[PDB]
Amino acid sequence: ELDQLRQEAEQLKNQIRDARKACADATLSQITNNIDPVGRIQMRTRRTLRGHLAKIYAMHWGTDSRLLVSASQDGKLIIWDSYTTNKVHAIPLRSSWVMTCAYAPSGNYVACGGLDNICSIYNLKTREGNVRVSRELAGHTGYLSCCRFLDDNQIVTSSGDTTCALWDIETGQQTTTFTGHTGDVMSLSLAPDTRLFVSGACDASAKLWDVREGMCRQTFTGHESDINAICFFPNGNAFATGSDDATCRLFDLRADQELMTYSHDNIICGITSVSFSKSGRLLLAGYDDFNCNVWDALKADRAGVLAGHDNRVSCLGVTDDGMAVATGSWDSFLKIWN
């Protein structure tokens, strides 16, 4: 019955596969074969941050490219100062299992979450000079894997129970729920216009979501394992993601097709984190081989290896101005490259 229609619309193309083979001329490699390679990229460690006690899972930068926050399994948040290696604030936590961080654009609030299935919002600047818990948002059913800010009074979360949600901080209730997956959700990225966002999954698939209306518009596939990280090209018209199959890929939205693949022959272990650059010419990726690789997006070859971490690299970040690379591994030393 309906299975035949589903097969006709999926297995028998019907603009889902036929329309894919009606938009590509030969390959983007033909167009890009007229660009000289970037060359050799060598980076060093400028400053090293110490003070944590356990492994590090997440970190986030700031709007001024000067202050950053990071989380550890110890159960503390530290607001650093990359210019002078000085600690400004240290905030304890109620749960020692933490997986996410955030940093409000106005620099007045800090968000956190983990295996307690609850998001916590702390106020930074207030009278009497002390940090205290300001909001405690609960209502999920799985476990949080990513949370981001939109303004001072709106926050978006993604959970491991195959859902995403948007919240109103002032009241404490949800407004829109994005359902419709099969596996867990491991990442989330916000477009640089505060209008849409993109969510990965554990079913080797990714989806693009609209905030206001609240339904999916585009779904992409083409992997064979869990999808780990995701981001945006700094224009709002492309993205790139990696998986546990040790392969990276780049996806578009208007053409609605896969364009570029990044892989090798000695890469057996998978990828953990993905981040882009200012001009989109530097894709930076972290693996569990105690290293961190740099690919040029247009080409499909490496151009730099960032060694120096004794243990597995877990978090990667770039600034807004464009002068930093922040890395955090399973040891307790954040590293800054320039």
Binding site: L2, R6, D25, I31, Q218, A255, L259, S277, K278, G322
Partner: protein, 53 residues
């Protein structure tokens, strides 16, 4: 079941959304590369005189 109907409706609504040629949607990244190729510090190194940080 309602799940089959929801899946069929999603497939129908995910097919007639129009498309574009791959070259036209693939030269955009190349154009953006030289659109902001001078403000990227990690790509083109800058003189060290810009403060000791």
């Amino acid at each position: 079941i309602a799940q089959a109907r929801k899946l069929v409706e999603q497939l129908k609504m995910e097919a007639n959304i129009d498309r574009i040629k791959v070259s036209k949607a693939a030269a955009d990244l190349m154009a953006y590369c030289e659109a902001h190729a001078k403000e990227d510090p990690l790509l083109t190194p800058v003189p060290a005189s810009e403060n000791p940080f």
